[PDB]
Nucleic acid binder design. Structure first.
Ligand SMILES: [Mg+2]
Ligand SMILES: [Mg+2]
Ligand SMILES: [Zn+2]
Lengths: 99, 114, 144, 56, 158, 139
RNA sequence: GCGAAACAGUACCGUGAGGGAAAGGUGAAAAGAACCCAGAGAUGGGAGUGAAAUAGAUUCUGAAACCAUAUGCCUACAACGUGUCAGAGCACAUUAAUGUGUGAUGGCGUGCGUUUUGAAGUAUGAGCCGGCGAGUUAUGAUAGCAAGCGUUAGUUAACCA
RNA sequence: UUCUCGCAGUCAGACAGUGGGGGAUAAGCUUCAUUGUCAAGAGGGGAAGAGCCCAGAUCAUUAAAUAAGGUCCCCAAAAUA
RNA sequence: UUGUGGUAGACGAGCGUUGUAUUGGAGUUGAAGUCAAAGCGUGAGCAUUGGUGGAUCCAAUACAAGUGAGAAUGCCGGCA
C-alpha cells in the first residue's frame, strides 16, 4: 500500500496515487518510468536494496522552481557579485508498483 | 550628443525597491535603504539554505530518539543494529516519518533485533 | 525537493500528571520535569506548537540536595536597586519556600524563548501533599 | 540637547495618539429650537425660562 | 569649461569655521551654474587615412561585385538625349524597366545637361561623373546604369 | 451619488484641521452641523461652511434623500505652501513656512457605500486579467 | 544651451569698485464656463461650450520623497540592525503558477561606503527623494592585434581641383 | 618557480608556535629568523574573538559517511566496567 | 580529467543609453513618457496586459560618444 523509493539521492515515502517532485530524469511527459531502486515496499525489507520489486510512475510536467536570487557581498571590500538559479524538477505520480 | 539617462536609473531603483516588500518603516520606500536590506536578506537566505538542511537532520534525530525511547533502546544503539548487521540504507527522514504511520516502523525496530 | 516534512499543528492534546518528590534530587527531577513539559518525549514533536503535558508536584519540601550544598550553595535574586542582592542558603530555602526552589530549578533549564514563559506556567509545584487541582483527573507516574 | 537619531513616522503618531479631541456636552434649549452647549445660554436669548439678553 | 564660463574668482564661503562643503569657486563642474569639465571641443579632427593603393583595391573589388550582379544594365549617351527636361518621361522609363523602389545610379563622362536637369527632383536617383563616385556612393545604389565608354577608362584605371 | 464639496487653500495647517475632521467623520448630518459649530476651534467654521455647502449640493444638484445623508469622508490634504523668511539673533535668517489645506468632504446616501468601490477595483483588475488571458490567443 | 528662450545685467546684495539669480507649453479656436444652489465673497457643486472640463486659467505629460483615507491580516508579558529558513491560523483568486496577501510561534542573525594590521563600532560621511556631478582631446613615441603593398620596397605633407 | 616582451599593484603589517637580541625570560611592548593564519577566508570547536584547532565555500537538494570538538536539560548525540 | 573564494590588480566576454548611415516595420483602431500586476533570463536587462497620456517610435548591422551614480560635511529644488 505504501513504498520507499530512492529517486536521485533522496528517499521518498509514497502511497497509491501520490504526486511527489524529484530531480530531472530526462524523460518525456506521459511515459511510464520504472524507478528500480526501492526498499520497504510492504512489510518486506530488502537489506541493501529490495530486489526484483519495481514501482511504475508517470511524469506530469518539467517545471522550474521559484528563482533563488543568490548574491554574495564581501562586506565593505569591493564585492557585489550576483547570480541566479532555477532548479528544474520533474513532477510525477505513481500508478502501480510491481511486487 | 548629450545623454541624460532618466529611464534607466528609475528602472534600476524600481527593481531594487520591488525586490523588498513588506519591510518595516522606510525600508520599502527609499532605494538607498532598500538595497542594503536586500543584500542582508539575501545573505541570510544563503546562510539559512544550508542551516535548514543542517537543522532538519537534527529534528529527525530528535523525533526518532523520542520514538525509540518508548521501545526500550536509544538512538545510538539503533544505528549499529542498522549498520553493522541487518544492513539498510534507510534515510533518517523516513526512519522518522514512518512513526507518523505506526505499526510499520515497529517492524523496523523488531527486525534489527536478530 | 522531496516530501515536505510533517509537523502537527494546533492539535495539542495534553494530560495532567502527578509526581511526589519523596527522595528525588533537584537536578534529576528538574531535567525530567523540563523535558516532560516541553513535550520532548512525543513521537511527533513540532518545535513551535507547545505539545507538552501538564505537571503537578507533591511534597516539594521533601526534595534532597546531595553533599553539603544545603549550607554552602547559595541562591541569589536582585532587585534593580543598589545592594538589592537577596542571598539565601539551601537549608534556609527548603524550610521557608521549597516551591520557588523547584520552580526556578525548572525555569532555568527551559530555553530562553517566548514559550518558556508559557511552558513554565504549566508546572504547579505544591509544598504539601494536599492540592486543589484534582478536578482535572491527573494520572500518576514515578520519578518524572 | 538635540535628537541624535531621526524620530521616525511611527513614534510621532504614537505620541499624537493622545492629541485627539472630544465633543462638548450639548442640550436642546427650551421654548426654542437649537443645540446650545450645556450650562450656557443659547443664542436664542433664553437660559431656561428666563430673560438674559436681546434677540441675538 | 570651468575657466570659460562667466564666473567669480571669489570664494563663496570661507575655508573653515562655517560648516558647509568646501566649494572653492562658484562655477565648479559639479555646481548647477556649471562649467562642463571635459565635454566636446570644436577642434576634433574626425579624419581617417586609407592608403591610396588600398583604396584603389577597394574600388576595384567593389566594382567587381557590383558590375556583375545582373542589375548594372548598360546605358548609352543616346537616351541621355531624346528626353526633354521633363522628369515625367524619366519615371516612365523607370517603371518601364521596373526600378521604381531601388536607388538607381548614373555614372557618366560628359555629364549631359538634359539628364542632369531631369532626375534632380527624384530623391532616389542621382547622376555622378566617373571620377565623382565613391565606394559608399556606389555600393549603396543596389542598381546602377553604367554608360557605354567608361568601361575602357575603368579598365585603364583598374 | 457622492455629491462632494471641496475648497482650495484654507489658511490653516492640515494637522490642526484633521483633529476636528476626525471629530465629524462617520456621523450623521443633523448631529454634525451643531457639533461642529459648537467647538472652540479655528477649523470649526471653515469646515462648517463647507459642510453646509455640501448639504446644499447633495440636496439640489444630485437630488438625494436629504435626511438620509451622513458625512462619509473627511480629509485635510497638504495644500501649497508659502516660504517666508524671518530675522533671528546674530543674523541667521531662518525660514518660516505658512501651511495650507485642501479641505474636502464627501457625503454618502446609502449606508454601505464602500464595498462597491472595492467592486470597481475588482472590475479594473478583472478587465486587466481578462485582457491578459485574451492575449494568450496568439496561436 | 550665452548669466539672460521672459521687460536680464533686471530683481537682489554691497556706500563703492564689484557680485548677481529663478521662471516657458490650456484648447483647433476662449467657443475663458451665461444661468441655478450654497456661501459675505473668493470659491465649490450643477448647467453650457467643447472630441476630451480628472483639458478651467493652479492651466501638456505628473514619478519619488512626504501627508492623509479605506478593503483584508496581525499587534497592548514585550529584549526587536526588523530580516531570513521553517511555520498555523485567517482572506482571496493569478502573466496557473508545487498561487497571492498577513504572519501567533521556533532556529539563526552586531547596516552601507571610507581608511585601516584589524571597524557594528565609543573612528569617519550621508535626514529622505529627484535631477546635475569626475579618465576626455590635440599632436607624438612605444607595444600588441588586423589590413594594404612588398623584396631598389612603403608612403605622402603643405597646396590646387 | 628558467628566459624575452606588455601592464601592473606593494615598501604603515598583525597575531600563534619555535630560537634569540633590547626590555625587568614585564607588557596584546620593540626588532630579527622560521613555520602557519589573517590581511585577501566564508564554515564547525573555542560562550562571545581577523591571527588558536579541524578545514578551503560554483549553485540547488527537507540525502549519507567523517575531521577538530563533544553526547544530564538549554543543545544533536552513550552506555558499560 | 583537472578545477570554478578572493581585496590591489592583469586579461577576456557582454548588457544598456542618445544620435548617425542602410535596410525592414508599427502608430488617433492610440506611439513615447508613467503607474500597477502572482512574467522571462547567469548578470548587466528584456517582455506581456490594463488604467492614464495624445504623436512619434521599434527591430537587425556597423559608427560616434557630454554613455551607466549611494556616498565627495557635493550643488540645486522639494519634503520630512
Ligand atoms: Mg554618532
Ligand atoms: Mg501631544
Ligand atoms: Zn434657544
Amino acid at each position: 500500500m505504501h513504498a520507499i523509493v530512492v529517486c536521485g539521492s533522496k528517499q521518498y515515502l509514497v502511497h497509491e496515487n501520490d504526486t511527489f517532485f524529484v530531480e530531472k530524469l530526462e524523460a518525456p511527459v506521459g511515459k511510464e518510468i520504472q524507478l528500480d531502486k526501492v526498499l520497504m515496499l510492504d512489510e518486506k525489507i530488502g537489506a541493501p536494496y529490495l530486489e526484483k520489486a519495481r514501482v511504475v510512475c508517470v511524469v506530469e510536467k518539467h517545471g522550474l522552481q521559484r528563482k533563488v536570487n543568490v548574491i554574495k557581498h564581501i562586506s565593505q571590500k569591493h564585492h557585489l557579485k550576483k547570480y541566479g538559479h532555477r532548479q528544474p524538477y520533474t513532477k510525477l505520480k505513481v500508478v502501480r508498483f510491481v511486487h | 550628443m548629450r545623454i541624460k539617462g532618466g529611464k534607466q536609473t528609475r528602472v534600476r531603483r524600481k527593481k531594487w525597491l520591488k525586490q523588498a516588500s513588506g519591510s518595516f518603516g522606510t525600508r520599502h520606500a527609499s532605494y538607498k535603504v532598500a538595497k542594503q536590506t536586500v543584500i542582508q536578506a539575501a545573505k541570510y537566505a544563503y546562510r539559512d539554505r544550508r542551516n535548514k538542511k543542517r537543522d532538519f537532520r537534527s529534528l529527525w534525530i530528535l523525533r526518532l530518539n523520542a520514538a525509540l525511547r518508548e521501545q526500550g533502546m536509544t538512538y545510538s544503539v539503533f544505528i549499529n543494529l542498522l549498520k553493522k548487521h541487518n544492513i539498510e540504507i534507510n534515510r533518517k527522514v523516513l526512519s522518522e516519518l514512518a512513526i507518523k504511520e505506526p505499526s510499520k516502523f515497529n517492524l523496523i525496530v523488531q527486525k534489527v533485533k536478530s | 525537493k522531496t516530501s515536505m516534512l510533517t509537523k502537527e499543528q494546533a492539535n495539542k492534546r495534553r494530560q495532567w500528571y502527578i509526581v511526589d518528590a519523596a527522595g528525588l534530587v533537584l537536578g534529576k527531577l528538574a531535567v525530567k520535569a523540563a523535558d516532560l513539559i516541553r513535550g520532548k518525549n512525543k513521537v511527533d514533536f513540532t518545535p513551535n506548537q507547545d505539545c507538552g503535558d501538564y505537571l503537578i508536584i507533591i511534597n516539594s519540601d521533601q526534595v534532597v540536595l546531595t553533599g553539603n550544598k544545603k549550607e554552602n550553595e547559595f541562591w541569589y535574586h536582585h532587585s534593580q536597586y543598589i545592594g538589592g542582592i537577596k542571598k539565601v542558603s539551601g537549608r534556609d530555602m527548603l524550610k521557608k519556600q521549597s516551591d520557588k526552589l523547584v520552580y526556578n530549578a525548572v525555569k532555568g533549564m527551559l530555553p530562553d524563548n517566548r514559550l518558556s514563559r508559557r511552558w513554565i506556567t504549566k508546572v504547579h509545584v505544591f509544598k504539601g501533599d494536599k492540592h486543589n487541582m484534582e478536578a482535572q483527573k491527573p494520572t500518576t507516574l514515578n520519578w518524572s | 540637547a538635540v535628537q541624535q537619531r531621526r524620530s521616525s513616522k511611527h513614534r510621532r503618531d504614537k505620541r499624537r495618539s493622545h492629541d485627539a479631541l472630544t465633543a462638548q456636552a450639548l442640550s436642546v434649549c427650551q421654548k426654542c429650537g437649537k443645540k446650545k452647549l450645556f450650562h450656557r445660554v443659547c443664542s436664542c436669548g433664553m437660559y431656561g425660562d428666563l430673560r438674559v439678553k436681546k434677540a441675538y | 569649461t570651468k575657466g570659460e564660463v562667466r564666473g567669480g574668482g571669489k570664494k563663496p564661503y570661507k575655508q573653515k569655521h562655517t560648516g558647509k562643503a568646501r566649494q572653492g569657486s562658484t562655477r565648479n563642474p559639479h555646481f548647477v551654474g556649471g562649467g562642463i569639465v571635459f565635454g566636446p571641443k570644436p577642434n576634433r579632427n574626425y579624419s581617417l587615412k586609407l592608403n591610396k593603393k588600398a583604396h584603389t583595391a577597394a574600388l576595384h573589388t567593389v566594382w567587381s561585385e557590383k558590375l556583375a550582379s545582373d542589375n548594372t544594365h548598360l546605358v548609352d549617351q543616346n537616351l541621355f538625349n531624346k528626353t526633354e527636361g521633363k522628369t515625367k518621361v524619366m519615371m516612365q522609363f523607370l517603371k518601364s524597366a521596373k526600378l521604381l523602389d531601388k536607388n538607381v545610379l548614373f555614372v557618366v563622362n560628359t555629364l549631359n545637361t538634359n539628364l542632369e536637369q531631369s532626375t534632380s527632383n527624384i530623391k532616389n536617383v542621382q547622376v555622378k561623373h566617373l571620377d565623382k563616385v565613391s565606394v559608399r556612393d556606389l555600393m549603396l545604389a543596389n542598381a546602377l546604369l553604367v554608360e557605354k565608354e567608361v568601361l575602357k577608362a575603368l579598365e585603364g584605371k583598374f | 451619488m457622492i455629491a462632494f464639496a471641496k475648497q482650495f487653500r484654507v489658511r490653516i495647517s492640515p494637522q490642526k484641521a484633521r483633529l476636528v475632521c476626525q471629530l465629524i467623520v462617520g456621523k450623521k448630518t443633523a448631529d454634525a452641523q451643531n457639533i461642529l459649530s459648537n467647538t472652540p476651534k479655528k477649523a470649526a467654521t471653515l469646515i462648517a461652511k463647507l459642510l453646509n455647502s455640501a448639504i446644499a449640493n447633495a440636496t439640489n444638484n444630485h437630488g438625494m434623500n436629504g435626511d438620509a445623508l451622513y458625512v462619509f469622508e473627511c480629509v485635510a490634504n497638504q495644500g501649497p505652501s508659502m516660504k517666508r523668511t524671518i530675522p533671528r539673533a546674530k543674523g541667521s535668517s531662518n525660514m518660516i513656512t505658512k501651511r495650507s489645506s485642501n479641505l474636502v468632504v464627501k457625503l454618502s446616501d446609502n449606508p454601505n457605500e464602500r464595498q462597491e468601490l472595492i467592486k470597481q477595483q475588482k472590475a479594473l483588475v478583472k478587465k486587466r486579467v481578462e485582457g491578459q488571458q485574451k492575449a494568450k490567443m496568439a496561436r
